[PDB]
């Protein structure tokens, strides 16, 4: 099985399962720990932001690859926004300050 681009889940904009919905492999906590043991900070960032969650990130990267430019923008993952909204639904106030 192999995938480059496909469909994404509804609640969290992430790839689907395996070989049934034409989905991608899963990058787990052990793999994250291995990449942290390595010095591949850029690889980890492009793994957990552009290829998975950043809605504008993935399309921008696709357009840059088609145009021949190997560069990316990190953006912000949708999963963290979903988590923030879920926490704000309780009686807990969490926010990001700019300074």
């Amino acid at each position: 099985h192999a995938r480059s681009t496909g469909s994404y889940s509804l609640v969290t904009q992430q790839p689907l399962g395996g070989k049934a919905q034409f989905g991608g492999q899963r990058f787990g906590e052990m793999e994250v720990w291995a990449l942290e043991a390595y010095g591949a900070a850029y690889t980890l960032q492009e793994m957990l932001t552009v290829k998975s969650d950043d809605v504008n990130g993935r399309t921008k990267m696709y357009k840059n690859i088609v145009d021949g430019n190997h560069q990316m923008e990190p953006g912000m993952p949708e999963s963290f926004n979903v988590l923030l909204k879920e926490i704000r639904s309780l009686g807990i106030n969490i926010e990001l300050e700019d300074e």
Binding site: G39, G68, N69, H70, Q71
Partner: protein
Amino acid sequence: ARVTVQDAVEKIGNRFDLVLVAARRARQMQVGGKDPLVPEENDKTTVIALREIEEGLINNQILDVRERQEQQEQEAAEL
């Protein structure tokens, strides 16, 4: 070829500043009118920049000086 980068790591230490400098040089070659300082043996920009670093004529100081000189020449072109 570039099987290993031992010579480049000797030239520039810490194995991370090497990565940063090589990425800078490869981006400069890929986007812009920059040209390689070594003969092109049908190699990618990463390999070409690693070979330039191994030869010892490309580093962060040289890149900064070249950027400063280019900026000064662009500013001097106001006629």
